Design a protein around this nucleic acid. Structure first.
Length: 128
RNA sequence: AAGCUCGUAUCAGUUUUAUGAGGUAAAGCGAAUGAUUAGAGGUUCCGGGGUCGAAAUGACCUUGACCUAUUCUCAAACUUU
């Protein structure tokens, strides 16, 4: 917006709705959570399509990036949280535990913990 | 309208006894019908067509069907039961 009204690019490719989009803290890359059972990676500057993170069986509600800017955590309908190493684009860790859907995810400023909450109503905090 | 043959002689707009018959409710498309959905990324002697080497399995694209990786799981009135 500062540079211009024209959009840099339009990013198409998702099968279903984009519920949430997030730039990394450095702003280099974007991971976006989509309903299509994938969270998609895009180059933040140009808007080009890097790849799909398949692994989710169901809609992905939100994404939140780590303070360290290496990873993104998502919470999905499939009732798991997935931390993905974005750089490698490989699934770093799958963290099951919720009985029901996980609506919200957040990654702490210090980087130490990830918090989650959702349909199950219980908070689960995850640590290194 | 016009006849024949008989007698304790034909039953019931109201009440109890639930044995048969049926194709309206449910389900499926994994051998029957339909609105069996919507995309991207590859591989080319020789699946089928051009340009450029007199040539030799010298090399490089585009335009249609697949595979791998996803989504929906097909309206109650099509049929049978």
């Amino acid at each position: 917006p500062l540079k211009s009204t024209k959009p840099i690019a339009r990013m198409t490719g998702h099968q279903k709705l984009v519920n949430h989009v997030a730039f990394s803290p450095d702003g280099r890359y974007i991971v976006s959570a989509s309903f299509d059972n994938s969270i998609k990676l895009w180059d933040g500057r140009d808007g080009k399509f890097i790849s799909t993170f398949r692994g989710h069986v169901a809609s992905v509600y939100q994404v939140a990036w780590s303070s360290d800017c290496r990873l993104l955590v998502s919470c999905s309908k499939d009732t798991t949280l997935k931390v993905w190493d974005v750089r490698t684009r490989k699934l770093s860790v799958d963290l099951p535990g919720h009985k029901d859907e996980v609506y919200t995810v957040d990654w702490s400023v210090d980087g130490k913990r990830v918090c989650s909450g959702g349909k199950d109503k219980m908070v689960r905090l995850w640590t290194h």
